[PDB]
Amino acid sequence: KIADYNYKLPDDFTGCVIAWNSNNLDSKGNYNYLYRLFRKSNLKPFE
Amino acid sequence: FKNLREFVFKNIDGYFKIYSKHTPINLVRDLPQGFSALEPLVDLPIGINITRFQTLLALHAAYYVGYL
């Protein structure tokens, strides 16, 4: 779901991914933060 | 109308490539023959999927359109 509908990377992606745990800065039940779950096609890079 | 403004627009990998060349001509009805080169001008890292194209004009204009 995430790799195709929320954030699409080029298959030749020369880069780094950094993850910061923020349970103390983002958690509430925080509803303002969502994710894309369904889409008919795959995203383009930088879309 | 000697200012012939030729442009090439491409959207590659989220980047906008602009090539242009201003040359003096004297055939406005059609495109004059000869050879020239268009030089890279601006690279715009936007990330938009462009499927439609619309010219913005001032209002109180003959142009040409091809495809690559």
User: Among candidates B27, B21, B22, which has minimal Cα distance to B1?
Assistant: B27
Q: What whole-number distance in Å separates Cα of residue B59 and Cα of residue B54?
A: 15
Residue found by looking up tokens 């080169």 in the block: B37
**Are B49 and A47 in contact (CB < 8 Å)?**
yes
- Neighbour-count burial of B8, counting CB atoms closer than 10 A to its CB (0-12 exposed, 13-18 middle, 19+ buried): middle
Return the residue in A8, A12, A42, A46 with the most chain B beta carbons within 10 A, the one to mutate for interface testing: A46
The answer to whether A46 touches B14, Cβ cutoff 8 Å, is yes
Which chain A residues have a beta carbon less than 8 Å from that of B13? 10, 45-46
Q: What whole-number distance in Å separates Cα of residue B50 and Cα of residue B30?
A: 29
**Are A47 and B13 in contact (CB < 8 Å)?**
no
Residue found by looking up tokens 């509908």 in the block: A5
Nearest CA in chain A to B47: A46
Method: cryo-EM
Q: What whole-number distance in Å separates Cα of residue B20 and Cα of residue B7?
A: 5
Residue found by looking up tokens 């403004």 in the block: B5
Resolution for the entry shown, Å: 3.3
Q: Nearest CA of chain A to the CA of B39: how many Å?
A: 26
Please report which helix (H) or strand (E) contains residue B17, including its range.
strand B15-24
